[PDB]
């Protein structure tokens, strides 16, 4: 299953943005984020499982991490061959240190991910490591890969002095990864990344994952699954988390309580957002049409009464959804606001 639509859309995005200089507030638009999100998800879907004769006994998702699988992934092959190979040729000119333009940033980060390559050129996992039963060894390699996607983007942000460019590390790259360790490994060692005008969506993504681990066990209130990769939540779930991890509100969503959730799915005609509400335990299935890339949203406001006041702002309207006006994107409790609801319509391990 090769979704060529996302390939075509990706190529056109790169054409539009190739020569667009990254400035202080520059961010990736809703449309472009949604294209990026589709590309990573469509890459995964094209070769979604390991082969029985070349399988990790740990259950590490080597189909998305190794050349053995990626080189036979038909989405990867079609993407790298598209338009006479033009995107692959562009990609090979790039590295972290020279990137200055939006389309260079997007192409480099994305093509590294869907090629299974670290920024230093090494594969995330070597083919000879696929079958390893050494959990600590494999865990360390995946943690490195996950961190370097984010660290490389922070290095770019600090050099250019940019606030809002952001592509996440997809969920499969968090195999046994401790989000508090990722956060502290990076932030404890570079004071420049703390500047409030630098790397704010990267910060928001990592900060949330530093306080809310992937598997919350009995504290989990929600669970998402895509192609066997699951994640749990007990707070509101900002769009920067769902976009960053590669999850969709059209994925398998399970509720473990009867708290209300508001699942935001699309922009409307009133400078607002449309959402579906769910309350009961079990599967929460959005049956509305999938919006186009220009309009699609992925965000959840969780409503309960035991959420700590220090965490309530993750569900605030203008933080839980990424503003399409780059300069006004919210990224922490200092700037999160919960105003504007009259424009919206109802359609119907770290532990917090």
Numbering used by the authors: 17 to 364, 382 to 385
Authors' text:
Vaccinia MV employs a highly conserved eleven-component fusion protein complex to mediate virus fusion with cells, but how it functions remains unknown. The A26 protein binds to A16 and G9 proteins of the viral entry fusion complex at neutral pH and, when purified MV was treated with acidic buffer, the A26-A27 protein complex dissociated from MVs at low pH, inspiring our model wherein A26 protein is an acid-sensitive fusion suppressor of MV. In this model, A26 protein binds to viral fusion complex to suppress MV fusion at neutral pH.
Our limited trypsin digestion identified aa 395–420 as an unstable region so we generated recombinant A26(1–397) protein and purified it through affinity and monoQ ion exchange chromatography before solving its crystal structure. The overall A26(1–397) structure consists of 18 α-helices and 6 β-strands, with an N-terminal α-helical domain (NTD; aa 17–228) and a C-terminal β-sheet domain (CTD; aa 229–364). This implies that the helix α2 is important for maintaining protein structure stability at neutral pH. Thus, our crystal structure of A26(1–397) protein strongly supports that His-cation pairs involving both His48 and His53 within the N-terminal region most likely contribute to structural alterations by increasing electrostatic repulsions under acidic conditions. Our results show that the NTD of A261-397 is highly positively charged, and the CTD of A261-397 is relatively negatively charged.
